[PDB]
């Protein structure tokens, strides 16, 4: 195909290669991220067992429907999901975290990545803003808003 | 009644009335898009009978859904939603799309519907934010955020 | 080569039967706005009342329309499907600026008034000639109607 | 035992067992359409497989049901319905039709059976009209009118 | 001007009324005999039949609401005293049934006159082209006739 | 059919006799009162016609469950509860009142009819607290708690 | 401080709650001889009792649950061992009944037990002011008399 | 003209019970607030836990609150319905920064305690007059609650 | 390129699929059959039994679907014409039943059949390695063998 | 606690305290309008009685809703939410409004009071704005739409 | 009542006797073990009360429905189930543990308890395998396969 | 001190059948992350078709994940858990970029068989060393992907 000044949606081609690409950092690190929590809730052990093993299903389920979703995004934008492992094993800033077998070791994993994944979205969202891409800020709000929430909720179990 | 500097929600009146007049415009545009939406539902051919009938439905409820949304934003802003066929003819950019019998028809048909309700609805946003109109706002960021996705699927349909 | 169409049943009739429906659907369909503006427009301390029996009525009049579409399919005919067709073909006016509860509450009455004969001449027609599925929805239509437009005149007493 | 005037539904028994006669034929071709139909369902290959095994299961799901009904209502009318294969086979107009594995074969069928089935209801209903036995009358309408709309529907496809 | 409301002919859509309210009457005393059924069925058919009476009221309840809307309909007044009813009633009060079989054949004698009378109901309304009613008796006919079909075989 | 010291339940049968007596006269009331709320609900005509039309409603099918639980209480104490409308008029307080088409008039029938059934239920409790039929006293109690709160209702519109 | 945890009065409270005790052994043997007849039950009642049985067993074992609360409510122990029911209970095993009128017999004779109980601990709890405990005995009461007169329906 | 009121009951003792209900409304109104403060501000490993229990008690009290202000109408009676009201007239205290579960947790039965008391001297005068239906509010009050107390008490044990 | 589509044997599979068809002829027979019990009976069974056989057939229709679809997984084809039932059926066509006994002393004998064709395919399978075989035979065989014993328990 | 220049979820402190401290004024505002609310549901007497019955609960449900997200944003910026009545009643510029029996009363109270929380949302959707505080804009602008729509409504039953 | 060579349902009677006779004993330890977990339930207390409450309802819960299954195999193999307390203490191996009152003690009882219900089930499940008595072979997988990972899960908790 | 495990099984034969287990889960991952792929990339007018068939599968697969890690964690065995993991034990290869239904669907079949292949080789080792809960876990999988190879291969006819 010939390149095209804009996209399918109306979008400059070029500005939304751009924010195509920082999405695609942030599936990166999601997907890191969410294996990280599956072996959370694999692995735990103690007496907080059951309720971390359902409250870490929780975290992953909602991780995964975000993960969906930000790939619809980059499709929308007419650009390429990454979609392998070693893929994202190359861009993710997220390390593979395994052998968690403690909550506090668990839970604050899931802080420190999700501190992450705020970061990259408010990056995100300031360069949408810039060129007008309201849908990509639109689910950049809705993230934040809702990692913003959690984050002060496991913060609150940790203290 | 006397004009009044501010409407009954708090926001300029001149204000208001420009935004409204432009979400009248959009308004008649939606109604005309769902009347071709409706038709390409009826009068659909050919193998993909089935599953195209299913997805016209689908389109048409969702538009439908928004119509409703903007009528109600545009009272909300004290002003009249155009509620007639004639008024809408008058007013809408989209050509009525009668005899459209073929699913790549169809589907081009609201591949560019969409691109005129996506273009209209940017503007509309644009204005709203240069006088903090956050409610009318609000409503554009959602369809657009919903219709730029819809064009990438249907766009992969007719690839 | 033969008189019958797809489903059976003649084919002149059928294209008949099938007019008539299109002007029905014309009417319902300028019908359905009105009520879609009586909807939006109303004021008053019947406002939240009337803002739901208005949608109750305006669903089930799009259902209908939904309905007839197909019926006309269903006939091997062309439903009308333009705004610019109905306007053309409808009998009902289009009314607008309705705001109060007894002029938009009279509009439903004088228009399903319409749609009843209508239906009844359509039923007529469906019966002699032995179009049972076409009779079968007037019935139904008719049916539904009469009782409504007993509680909207009942309202309006 | 002893032959009645009336019976126990209070109509005429000779024209109920008349009516009962035509609509235990009519029941005879429901069960070979249904069994083609299960066929239908479970032969199909190529591309439209899950579209045409989901139609199939729907068109034969809504077949049983009416198999249901018939049958329920030659017992209304103190008649015996015809329950065995052979009974059904002796007596159904609709041939068994068999190793159709394609989309077009399939839904033709359909169509041709729907084109008897409707003509044998036809007569039903101007018979049950005669003697004003409106229950047999208002099961043959409701099958009738729900029928064109199918072939209406494969028709369509098949275009 | 020279139609009801709905838009039928005024005098027989009143003859019809008078025929639809002689109905309810009908339908009116035979739920409350089928409650009694209900209440006081004994023997080893008793949950069986608790629950078969009160299925079998529950749908006369609801025909009921439609009668009475379908009489409204056709501007007329709808009865609506046991008084009323008790005067217009063919089916007569049955009391103190408490076996399977007489509750059962009760109601088969009862469902006997009610498909009799929506019958002629059915035959004016088409006389008439009054097509509401017709579909009305329409839907309460078939049903009714498959019910005493299912009566009479458990009573066989 | 020897009389019996006491009841299926264990309970005296002379007292339960009584207080089956009194339940049948409650019933018996119930029975007129529920069919004159089914009159209000036809009947009700002018701008009241949605609102009480549904409320009506609500009210009469309440009385309903209210009287199948009334029989059964009967049934329970091995009395015949009423079951004809010959014996309800014979025994019933509460009058026919028909062709009350306005809703002050209805309303005003409900606050009168519930006054009437309150003190009657009252009766009734003081009568089972008298000799320990916690079962009846319980059923009292459930009905007054629920009436009162209608009463107030009902006059709260009426004002 | 002359009341324990509730508010209510500690000696009248472990009163009421060795007779909850005494409840609830019989209603463990009930249940116990319920399943059973569930299990057990031969016969054209097969069906309509193997249903009603688990019906009756099912609303039993919340009121099991209901009264050990209560009992735990009161700070007694409620018992918690077959050992300890089948001394506490009066209700006796009953095994091997295959015949819906012996296991139906034995239902009311059961019930007959617990309403005899039940109103003797809503009396002692309505003398000392325990509205909680008479609460929940009104309940099963009013409950179980209803079914006792189902259960003498279906046996008449 | 009449001793009685509106649902039949004497209106002097309608009174005095209304007057009671309201102040055991207040301690209510009071305590629902503590309670929310409890859910809103808990941190430690009991968070997820106890953030999900103190939203169950004060959801259930708030449908207690609704169906006592109810009842206060019931009997002819205005039920208080202002904050500065309810601070008068309650004895539970504004309970404010506790943070941690054992302080929240003995604060709702410290408050339970207070309410089934009070709920105990109602059930009595209602008793004693006939007011059955005031009665049995409190009954269903009372056993609920003394059930709430065994659980929560077990927790801090 | 030895195994067919999903990794089995070729000749074991065609010798599963045909032993699995004639299984399939005969639920159709006895699914047909029990269509006519459900339509057919009469007296004060009606209602029990019209519902019981409903559930019986509607449980048969289930497994037919899932016959031909494993029939279609080992690459066969399933036999969907009644003349072809009717020649490969070892369950006779049973009509004019009427009476609860007889017909369900017919589907004791017809789920006898079933359970001896299942066992013996059940067999061959585990001989073979064919697990998902063995697992429709294993699911079919535990569920049939309990409704047996609750269809001989009625008939006791 | 030491001070810190950012907060658990990466904000500037000293602005999401400021952020903080203005979203407490408003859910004080929120108590209060909620508690009058109570009792417009439980004091409104006459024909419009279940109506507004149930329209006042609908609306203080709803505003209950806000309470709950209002609290927990406020915890989320690391800040404490108001908990007491004492405290509402300080800082609150909506009164305590009491025996509003009316609907017309009640109705323009509400109309009053939800002028005043639109107004401060849109002020604190300003300052967040100004800082980049996504998460409570996001907040702010679904409350500000939401409200517009129902101002809207409520001034039509009042025309 | 004559002894048969099978039983009803076609297997061997002999051989099914055995069987049952296995069934019956694992029967017996299910209900002891039942009724100690019902006792856990009510009597636990500190700080792990909601949790436990829950998580050994959702136990006993499990093993009732067992308990069913288990009684109607031994009826399906012609059988006489086990029904009373007296007879399951005295076939029981599982002995009577009452007064748990701590998450450890009562935790540590079920593994004890399901350790011993594998055995004996895999015990029956190999000599139902000698016969090829498949539907009890099939009941006793089922029981095992769950009974596993629920150990796992308990015995996760309890590091 | 005991040669079996937690659960009762042999411990050397428990982990060797864990290995064998985990084996298949790098399988399952790589495979999982493929289907993520055509659904995500699917074009051409399969595209809702194929994008829901695509996402039904991929769901299903998540849930024999899910059950495959815990059947690893019963055994008293380590589940491998990270990306890097999966891709040194992996068979099954990473495949990007299909964007056409044929392709992707084949995809599927091959990467089925795999599976098929190497848990009827589980199925085997459970059944010989006793392990029922393993066998049983292998045949619920084997049963229903071998109707579901049915099906794609029926569709690619
Ligand atoms: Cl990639
Ligand atoms: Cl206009
Ligand atoms: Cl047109
Ligand atoms: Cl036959
Ligand atoms: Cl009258
Ligand atoms: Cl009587
Ligand atoms: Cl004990
Ligand atoms: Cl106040
Ligand atoms: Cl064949
Ligand atoms: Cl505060
Ligand atoms: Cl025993
Ligand atoms: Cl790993």
Chains 1, 2, 4, 6, 10, 11 share one sequence.
Do not use: C
Not at 58 to 75: F, G, H, M, N, V
Not at 90 to 102: L, V
Request: net charge negative; charged share 20%; glycine share 6%.
């Amino acid at each position: 195909s010939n390149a095209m000044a804009t996209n399918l949606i109306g979008l400059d081609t070029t500005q939304s290669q751009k924010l195509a690409n920082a999405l695609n950092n942030l599936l990166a690190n999601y997907q890191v991220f969410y294996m990280n929590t599956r072996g959370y809730h694999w692995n735990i052990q103690g007496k907080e067992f059951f309720e971390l093993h359902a409250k870490f299903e929780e975290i992953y389920t909602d991780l995964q429907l975000k993960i969906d979703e930000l790939a619809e995004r980059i499709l929308t934008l007419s650009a390429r999901p990454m979609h392998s492992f070693s893929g994202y094993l190359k861009a993710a800033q997220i390390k593979e975290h395994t052998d968690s077998i403690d909550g506090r070791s668990s839970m604050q994993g899931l802080v420190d990545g999700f501190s992450i994944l705020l970061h990259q979205q408010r990056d995100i969202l300031e360069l949408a803003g810039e060129t007008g891409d309201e849908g990509t800020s639109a689910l950049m709000s809705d993230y934040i808003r809702e990692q913003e929430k959690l984050v002060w909720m496991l913060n609150a179990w940790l203290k």
